[PDB]
Amino acid sequence: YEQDKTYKITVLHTNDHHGHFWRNEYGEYGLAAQKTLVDGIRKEVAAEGGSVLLLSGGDINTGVPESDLQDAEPDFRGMNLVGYDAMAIGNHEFDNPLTVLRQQEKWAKFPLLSANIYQKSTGERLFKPWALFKRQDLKIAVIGLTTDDTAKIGNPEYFTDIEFRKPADEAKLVIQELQQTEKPDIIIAATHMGHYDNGEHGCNAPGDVEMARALPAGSLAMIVGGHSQDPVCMAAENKKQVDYVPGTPCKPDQQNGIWIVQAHEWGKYVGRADFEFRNGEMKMVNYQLIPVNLKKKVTWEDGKSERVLYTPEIAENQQMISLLSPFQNKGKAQLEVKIGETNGRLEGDRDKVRFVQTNMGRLILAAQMDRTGADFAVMSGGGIRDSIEAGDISYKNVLKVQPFGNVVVYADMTGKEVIDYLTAVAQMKPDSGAYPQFANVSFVAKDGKLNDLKIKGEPVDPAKTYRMATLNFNATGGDGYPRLDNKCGYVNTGFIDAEVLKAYIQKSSPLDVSVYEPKGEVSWQ
Ligand code: NI
Numbered sequence: 001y002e003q004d005k006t007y008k009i010t011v012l013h014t015n016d017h018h019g020h021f022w023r024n025e026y027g028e029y030g031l032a033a034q035k036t037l038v039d040g041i042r043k044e045v046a047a048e049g050g051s052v053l054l055l056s057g058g059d060i061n062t063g064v065p066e067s068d069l070q071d072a073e074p075d076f077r078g079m080n081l082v083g084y085d086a087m088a089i090g091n092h093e094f095d096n097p098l099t100v101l102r103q104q105e106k107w108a109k110f111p112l113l114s115a116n117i118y119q120k121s122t123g124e125r126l127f128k129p130w131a132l133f134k135r136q137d138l139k140i141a142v143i144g145l146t147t148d149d150t151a152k153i154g155n156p157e158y159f160t161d162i163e164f165r166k167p168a169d170e171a172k173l174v175i176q177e178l179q180q181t182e183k184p185d186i187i188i189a190a191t192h193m194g195h196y197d198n199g200e201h202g203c204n205a206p207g208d209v210e211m212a213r214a215l216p217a218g219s220l221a222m223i224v225g226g227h228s229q230d231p232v233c234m235a236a237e238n239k240k241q242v243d244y245v246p247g248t249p250c251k252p253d254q255q256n257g258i259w260i261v262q263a264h265e266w267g268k269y270v271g272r273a274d275f276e277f278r279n280g281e282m283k284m285v286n287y288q289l290i291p292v293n294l295k296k297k298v299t300w301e302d303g304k305s306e307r308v309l310y311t312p313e314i315a316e317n318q319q320m321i322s323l324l325s326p327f328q329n330k331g332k333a334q335l336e337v338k339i340g341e342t343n344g345r346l347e348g349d350r351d352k353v354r355f356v357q358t359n360m361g362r363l364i365l366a367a368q369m370d371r372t373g374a375d376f377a378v379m380s381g382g383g384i385r386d387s388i389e390a391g392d393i394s395y396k397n398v399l400k401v402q403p404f405g406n407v408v409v410y411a412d413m414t415g416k417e418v419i420d421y422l423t424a425v426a427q428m429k430p431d432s433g434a435y436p437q438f439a440n441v442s443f444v445a446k447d448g449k450l451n452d453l454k455i456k457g458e459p460v461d462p463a464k465t466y467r468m469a470t471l472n473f474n475a476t477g478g479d480g481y482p483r484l485d486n487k488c489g490y491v492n493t494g495f496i497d498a499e500v501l502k503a504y505i506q507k508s509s510p511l512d513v514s515v516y517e518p519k520g521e522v523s524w525q
Helices: 029-045 074-080 096-109 169-182 209-214 318-337 359-372 394-402 415-425 499-507
Strands: 007-014 053-055 085-089 117-119 131-135 138-146 162-164 186-193 222-223 234-236 253-255 260-263 269-278 281-291 297-301 304-308 338-342 376-381 391-392 407-414 436-439 441-445 450-453 463-471 490-496 522-525
Touching: 007 029, 007 138, 007 186, 007 222, 029 053, 029 074, 029 269, 029 318, 053 131, 053 138, 053 186, 074 096, 074 318, 085 138, 117 359, 138 169, 138 234, 162 186, 169 186, 169 209, 209 253, 209 260, 222 522, 253 359, 260 269, 260 490, 297 522, 318 394, 338 499, 359 376, 359 407, 359 436, 359 490, 376 415, 376 441, 394 499, 407 499, 415 463, 490 499
Parallel strands: 007 053, 053 085, 138 186, 186 222, 222 260, 376 463, 441 522
Antiparallel strands: 007 269, 117 162, 131 138, 253 260, 269 281, 297 304, 338 391, 376 436, 407 463, 407 490, 441 450
16 A cells, blocks of 8 residues: 555445345335445445445345245345445355355355355365455455354254354464465454354354454454344443444444444444554544434324334335345245145134144244254244134245244253243233243143143153243243343244244145144143
């Protein structure tokens, strides 16, 4: 570069897009409004003498039926039209086989990066570790890293020949290789690892904060993150704002001289970090998280309910809407295709599910345990929102039963944590949404205490390990359920309730409802 010259560099970022190429049902986000916003930024940045780099923290895949059924094709193409420069590979990039991910890499006109994922049989990288960019006459390297929780938490049959090495250790190596060979002026990491306040990752793999603290000071200008699905806007040193409000000031984290940023999920925001580079040094001069037509739900004095924009409305780019519409249309048609059949009614009438054990509870929970490899499972009966009629089943029928996009989760727990949890959960009452549906659970409750507690037909052993499935809602205290998210053994899978029930029905069909029919395994009084 030229000594004593100030370069202007604007870094844009998103992450955890999870199939949200289309806006949602209240008119928020979507890539069309993203495109309008980012196109306008590029012109402004250029008018002021600067350059743009646009990066993703990954997890493009998995979260919306119309995207998932088309292997995220609309998403990746849309990202081309927005103009992404690079992306980190996310754990949900491994939800589908490598055949599909390699096809995504060819759909994408930008690299999908990860330095830390190796083939076990050869010791070679499966992906490109970094990409180099020219902006002005600066050389900018972007390294990609992926959480090493991927393979403890994803389909084991996919990871026979795939190893996830510690990312922080990989970053130290790549930074040293880069600094000894290509010699970039600036290095940024796009990662998929997560932001934990003060590096308190608990039982998750270490994330961005721990990494930045482990690296040499200032060796990265910044980390563009993901996976935890947070707006990184600090309330105070080492503490994110809880309930960040769109359109407000957002101070990103800085740890050991390294900025750490994240833009939540689902294209809700485009993050914008403006930097000035002079004589080797990067200075952050402005940061903002820019809402993409995010709205707040309000009920005013008169019971008129609306969603109100936090910031001025961004118009949908028409060229992105032409690109995306045929996928949206094909996805909506794919929802009506038969995915299974049942030989009797699956019962999800509001009363039945809030009062007694139904065959819909058993079907949903089998689906959740099949997905997480769990031993047993519970949810709120008021999570079940409809029945499926005896006969053919479409994804659309399943979306009626599970329409609100909750996330399936699991927890590993001692037989004794099992006993303490099911105990307080069996205190929940009928005529109420909190009423527990259970699977692979048998007991007789009397006096708020459990007698003949059986997971899958065997008594519980207090020093045994058991895997429970449930929903994110129940796991974070919802329905006054005992919190599981601050426990060791907890894992948020990112898989959506309707997708999990649909997949389970597709592979189990045709269904024989008698295997799902409750035979009095749980009872009270
Ligand atoms: Ni993730």
